[model samples]
Every structure is written in structure tokens, then in C-alpha cells.
Target: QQWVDCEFTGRDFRDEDLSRLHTERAMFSECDFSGVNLAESQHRGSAFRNCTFERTTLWHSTFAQCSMLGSVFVACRLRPLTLDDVDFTLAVLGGNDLRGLNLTGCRLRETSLVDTDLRKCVLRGADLSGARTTGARLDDADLRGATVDPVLWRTASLVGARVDVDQAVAFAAAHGLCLA
Candidate 1:
């Protein structure tokens, strides 16, 4: 299935088989996609504003230049997903296993990532300002050139996580260490 330049609002698409679906320049607002199988789907230049994706399976899906602003993803399978320049501002991605994903250049401002496992993930140049990362596991994750907040160092687990020089200084400052 392919959706091009389409717009939907307040629509119920629960338990839909959107596997291998391709969408471009589409807009979905207040849509419900609970239990939907969006596996192997590809989307670009689209926006899913304030949508609900409870128990949705987005395995191996790819999204580029898309915005999921204010969307709620509860128990969604987002593993093996690819994202490029995607915006997830104010989106809820709590308790998700996003291990080993490359999120370069993605925007996650004020996004909720509580308890999300991002082990070995590459987040180079990603914007994570004000993102809620309480109990989030960033072990061995690459955060070079990514914009982070002070609360990230205190809340998230960064054991063996890679960081740039500036980020290292910020991490030390967050721990109350006096910098030279």
C-alpha cells in the first residue's frame, strides 16, 4: 500500500496491515494505529501529529525527513528501524528497546525516552535538548556532537557511552566536578 500526499485526521486505523507500506508527503493528525503492523514500511517527508501507536509493530521500518511530533508510542516494536532527519519532538517513546539503531541528525527535543534501551546506538549530531531520559540505558551509545541537557548525565545510564570533548566537559559539570 502507498499513500502519497494524503491527509487524515481523527481516523481509526487499528490493527491494519500496513506492512511494506510506502508513504510520501502525507499528514496524519490524531490518528489511532493500535496493533497495526507497519513492518518494513518506508515513509518520507510525512507528518504524524499527536497520533497513537499502541502495540504497533514498526519493525525494520524506515523514515526520513518525517515528523512524529507529540505522538505516543506505547509498547511499540521500533527495533531495527532506520531514521534520518526525523523529528520526534514531544513524542513519548518510553520503555522501548531501540538498541543498535542509527539516529543521526534526528530531532528529539523534549521527547520522553524513559527506560528506553539505546545500547550501541549512533546518535551523532542528533538534537536531544530537554529530552526526558530517566533510567534510559545509553550504554556504549555514540553521542558525539549531539546536543544534550544536564539532566541527561544525572538520570540516564551512560556506562561506556561515547561522547565528544565538549560533551565530556558537560558530563563532568553535571557531576559537580570543577573544570579547568
Candidate 2:
């Protein structure tokens, strides 16, 4: 089914099968999507602001240029999804296994990613300014061309992570090293 430019606010869609649903520029505010199966769904330029996604299955879903501001994802299956230029500003994605995902050109400004497993993920050209990454694992992840703050280097685990030369300097600066 296709939903274009529609608005759904505070709607409860729990335990529903919305797989293969196509939406373009649709807006969902404070919607309850707990236990919903959104596999293979395609959403472009849509907004899911402040929505709740608990135990949601989003396998192979494609969300291009979508915004998930203030949304919370609890134990959701978000692997193998395609997210292009998506905005996750202020979203709560703590304690999730998001390993090996490509988040290129995404905006994650001020998002809560505490204790999230982002190992081996690709974050090229993404904006992660002011994000809360306490206890987050970014081991072997590619963070080149991404905008990150010093707090991330201090709090998150960057074991074997890849960063640009400037980012290396920033990482050193966060550890009280005065580079020349």
C-alpha cells in the first residue's frame, strides 16, 4: 500500500504487519509502532517524529531521506536496512546492536546512543555532533569525514576505529595531549 503526504498522530499500530508498505513524505507523530513488522518497507522523505518502536522488525527496510527525530527504538531489529541521508536527531537508540550498518550522510545530532553496539559500522560524512555515546562500542568502525565531538572520543570505545588525520588530532586533544 502507498501512503503519500499523509499525517498520522498518536495512532496505535501495535502488532501490525506493515511490511512492504510504501510511504513518501508522510508524517507520523507520537505513533505507537511496537511489535510491528515493517520488513521491506520503503519510506522516502517521511518523518516519524517522537514515535515508539519496541521490538519492531525492520529487516531490509529502506528509508531514504527520512527523519526520525525524537523517536525511541527499543530492541528493534534494524539490521540489513538501507538508510540514506536520514536524520536521527535527538532519537533514542541506546543499547541496540547496529553493527556493520552504513550511516552515510545521516544527521545524528544530539542523539542518545548510549551503550549502543556500532562495531565495524560505516559513518562516512555523517553528523554526530553532541551525540551521547557513553559506553558505546565503535571498534573497527569507519568514522572518516564524520563530525564528532571530543566527548565521544573520551566516553566511547574506539578500539581499532578508523578516523581522519584531523579526527586523530581531536581524539588526542580529548585526552589532554597538546599536539603541535
Candidate 3:
């Protein structure tokens, strides 16, 4: 389905199956996508500001150059996703399944990933300043190129994860612990 330049503000897309749809340059501000299935969909240049995606299935979806400011993905499934050049300022991804996702070059300032599973995810070149990841699992993830707060790093799971020596020291200092 094509939805070019169409505005879907405050629309309810609950339980909708938007899988494999092409939604380019569309605005979906404040929309409700509870239980919506958007697997393998292409969303290039689309804006999804402040939308609710509770229990949505975004598995294997490709979001190229999408603007997702202030969106909520609570309890959603987003495994194996590629979010290239996506802007996620203040977005909430609480309790989401983000295992093995690639968020390279994405803007994630003030984003929240509380209780989310981000194991083995690649977050290279991502900006995570002021982001919160309370109870999030980032095991074996690569955070070498991301800019993040020291406190946030302490709360995240960095065990066996790859990071620079300096960054690791900073994380240790923030938590008042020693790392060998």
C-alpha cells in the first residue's frame, strides 16, 4: 500500500496488518498501533511522532531515514530490525524485543529502553546521550562508537560487551567498581 504524503494524525490502527506495505513520506503522529503487525515493511522518510506501538510486531522491518521522534514501542517485538539513519529523540522502547537489531547512525537522545532486550545489538555511530536503559539487557553488544552518559552505562548490561578502554574505565568509575 502506498501512503505518500498522507497525514494519519491521531488515527487508531489497532490490530491492523500493515506488513509489507510501502509507507513513504507519510505522517503518523499520535496514532495508535496496538497489536499491529508491520513485519518486513518499508518505511522510508516517514514520520511517526508520538505514536503508540504497544504489542506491535515490527520484526525484520527496515526503516531507512525515518523520523520517529517521541514514539512509544512498549511491549513490542522488533528483532532483527535495521533502523538506518532513524531519529529517535525521546522515543520510548520499554519492554521491547530488540535482540540483534542494528541502530547504526541513529539519533537516540533521551531515548528510553527500559526492560528491553538488546542483546548482541550493534549501536555503532549512534548518539545515546541522556538515554535511559534501566533493566535493559545489552549483553555482547557493541557500544564503542556511541556517545552516552556515564550513569546510563552503569545501569546497562555491559558484561562481555565491546567498548574502548577509556569508556570501560568511565563505566567502572560511574559504578564505583573495578574492571580487569
Candidate 4:
């Protein structure tokens, strides 16, 4: 485990072996981590803006209070990872494995999750406003207290999910669907 603090900025770490490294309060702005192995690593309060994580292996990693705006996770394995209090607004998470992941209390406004596999994940209190999940599968996931536009639900798959009756009625009303 290497302790990297205030020593790496704008450095090309593309295809580097960074597995099991502890990076706390590190600034990784504009760093290329494409195909980099980062499995079982811990990142606390780190900023990874505009970093490339294409095909990166981030399985079993813990990220707390981390900001990853505009970071790409294309074709990455993110299973068994805890992302508590993380802000991924406008981040690209297409083609990533997100099964059984708890995304509760996360801000996902305008986050491009197009063609992403979100099967059986927790969506409680998640802000999905302006998020595009067209043709994405969200089966058996919890949608309680989720904030989303009524029009976007048409393209979302919400089978076997639970929602309040009042909220359902409100959603129907917003979409001009009259329910008795």
C-alpha cells in the first residue's frame, strides 16, 4: 500500500498497477486510470474529476465522501463496493456491473446511466431527476422516496418495486393519467 498525498497531479497513471493502494485526500484530477487495477483499495475524500476508468477493476473498494464528477467507468467491475456519501453527478457509468449495490442518499442528477445494468439495486431516496436510463433494467429494486420526472418513468423498468400509494397517485396525476 503506497501513501500518495500531494505528490501526484496530472501524472499519467494509465495502465499502471495501483491495486491495494491507500489514497487519502489525494487530488487525481485529469489522471488516466484506464485498465488500471485498483481492486480492494480505500479512497477517502479523494477527488477524481475527469479521470478515465475505462475497463478498470474497482471491485471490493471503499470510497467515502469522494467526488468523482465527469469520471468514466465504462466496462468496469464495481461489485461489492461501498459508495457512501459519494457524489457522482454527471458521471458516466455505462456498461458497469451494479448488482446489489446500495446507492441510497446519492445525488444522481443528469448522470448518464444509459445501457447500464442496475438490476436489484437499492434506489431509496436517490435523486434521479434528468437521469437517462433508456432501455436499462431495474428489476426487483427499491424505489421508495425516489425523486424523478414523471416522463422519465416511461423508459425505466420498475417491476417488483415498492412505492407509496400517494406517491403513485401523484405520479399518475403528473402524467395526466386519471386514476379512480
Candidate 5:
């Protein structure tokens, strides 16, 4: 509980498990936070630009109005995470297991979800436009009111994935079953 409103530019916080840090409104620009465990923590109005969080466990945490641009989160654990209008533009979350999580209205523009597990996750109103979903798992994931590229479903495993009626029509058409 020490870093307050501080700018952590170019700081190497890799593999550091400082879970007790009271980091609020902190600007983490170009910081390396790889393999860090930020579990049971909360960040309000924090800005993380070009930060790397590979293999980090951000479980049971809350992030409100955070800016995470160009952050890499390969193989990270983000279960039970709470967010409030967080921006994840250009984030790389490849190979992460985000099963049964609530990501309502999350900004996932241009993010990579290659080989990630998103099973039974609540993704209502989420914007996944231009995001990569190659080899990703989306089985039983709720995608109602989602805005994504038409080609996104092509690469992901969508067995039993739930969608709205309007999306179901598109799904039928994509699977070569023309709805009359």
C-alpha cells in the first residue's frame, strides 16, 4: 500500500507478487509486470500503457476505468475479476482460461484470443471487433448483443455457444443452413 499516483515508467516489476500494494490512479507506462500475482487487489482509475502481464493471476480483483493499451497477458489467470468500463485495446490475451467469467461490455478491440478458453462466459454487449479468436474455445459462451467480425466465429470452437435470435440467423447462414 505505497505506490500512489506514481508513474512507473520503464520499471521492471517482473515476477513481483506485491499483492498488498495500494495502487490507485497509478500510471504504469512501459512497465514489465510479467508473471506477477495481483490477486485480491483493486485498481481504480489506473493507466497501464504498453505493460506486459504474462502469466499473471489477477483473480478476485476490481479494475475501474483503467486504460490497458498494448498490454500482453499471455497465459494469464483472470478468473472472478471485476471491471468497470476498462479499456483493453490492443491487448494480447492468448492462451488464457477465462471460463464462466462476466465480461459484459468489455472493450476487446484488436485483442488476440488465440487458443484461449472462454467457455460459458458471459460476454453480453462485448465488442470483440477485429479481435483474433484462432483456435479459441467459446463453447456455451453467451454472446448476446456482441459486436464482432463475421470471420471471428470461423476460427473459434463454438460448440453450443449461445447467441441472440438475430445472431442465430447469421449463425445458421454461416453453417450453410439458409433460414427461410
Candidate 6:
């Protein structure tokens, strides 16, 4: 059940059973995996560049050390999904719940995270510059040293978000506070 270094670019895997397959270093560029069952699969070190995963199931699936650069996951099921040190750079995860997730130092620049719940998420040092965080929740989230633009931070929900001194100053400045 191993598919090492396999390529499945621009293919349709809708309603297909891709479970229990060990795919190490495999490539799936621009592939459609809508309604597919990716549960119980091992995709270690795999790259899903620009792939579409609408309504896909990732329950109990292992994406350890995988690269999902520029991937789109609309309405996907992610319950019990395993993601250790995965790269979600520039991914579109709008309206998703990323609470209690550890995305430390991940490249999240320019990602669409609108209406996403990042409560209590460990995003230390994560590059969130130019990300659309409008209506997103960052309550109790640790964003120390995280790269957050002033415009985006102004429009986001930051109730109880942990920030450093510099960020606090910036937050105050954005809120029309006169600090001498």
C-alpha cells in the first residue's frame, strides 16, 4: 500500500477510496480530491501543490511533514486528522476552526483566514503578514513574535490574544490612543 514518489497531477479522485495508502514524497499538483476518503492514510513528506480538496475527509489521516503550498480546502472534514510539522504556506482555510493547533513558524503569509477560529492556537513566530484576518478570532492565542500587519490586526478579533510589548504598542496606535 505504498506509493512512493508518485505523481497524480490534474486528476479527478472524487468519491474515491484513497485510504490506507502510504504515500511518501508523492506529488498531487492541481488534483481534485472532492468527496474522497483520505482517512487512515500516511502522506509523509508529500506535496499537494495547488490541489483542491472540497468536502474531502481527512479523519485520522497522517499528513506528517507534508507540504500543502497553495492548496485549497473548502468544506473539508478534518476531525482527528494528524498534522505534525506540516507546511501550510499560502493556503486558503477560510471559515475553518484551527483552535488548539500548533502552527509554530509556519509560512502563513497572505493566507485567507477569514472567519477562522484561531483561539488558543500556538502561532509563535508564524509569518501572518498580508493575511486576511477579517472577522477571525484570536482569543487566547499566543502570537508572540508573530508577523501581523497593522491593517489586518485592526480588523481581526483579538480578545485576550497574547502579544508582546511591540505588538501592544502597535495595537494601541491603531486604536487612536495618544501615547506620549
Best candidate according to TM-score: 2
Each model's TM-score, in the order given? 0.97, 0.98, 0.92, 0.90, 0.90, 0.88
Give the total clashing residue pairs for model 3: 0
User: Per-residue lDDT tens digits of candidate 1, residues 1-180?
Assistant: 899999999999999999999999999999999999999999999999999999999999999999999999999999898898899999999998889999987899999999988899998999999999999999999999999998999999999999999999999999999987
Candidate 5, residues 42-152, lDDT tens digits: the string is: 888898888988878888888888888888887777887887778888888788888998888989898888888989988889999889999889999989998877667
Give the per-residue lDDT of model 3 (tens digit) for 44-161.
8999999999988988798988998999987777777778899999999877778878887789899998887878988887888988889988898888878878876778887877
| Positional deviation of residue 31's Cα in model 4 after best superposition, in angstroms | 1.4
lDDT by residue (tens digit), candidate 4, 62-135: 88888887788889888989988787888888767787789987877777888777788898888888888876
Residue 146 lDDT, candidate 1, scale 0-100: 96
TM-score of 2: 0.98
lDDT of each: 0.94, 0.95, 0.86, 0.79, 0.84, 0.85
> What digit string (tens of lDDT, one per residue) describes model 6 on residues 1-180?
899989988988889988887899999999998899888898888999899889888877888788888898887776556677777778888887778777777778888888888888888888898888888889989999998888766888888889999999888888888789
Lowest summed lDDT across 10 adjacent residues in model 5 is found at 169-178
TM-score of 3: 0.92
Ranking by TM-score: 2, 1, 3, 5, 4, 6
Give one digit per residue, the lDDT tens place, for model 2 in 1-180.
999999999999999999999999999999999999999999999999999999999999999989999999999999989998899999999999999999987899999999999999999888999999999999999999999999999999999999999999999999999987
Between candidates 2 and 5, the one scoring higher on lDDT is 2
Better of 1 and 5 by lDDT: 1
The segments of candidate 3 whose C-alpha lies over 4 angstroms from its true place after superposition are 176-180
Query: 4 in model 6: Cα distance from truth in Å?
Result: 0.9
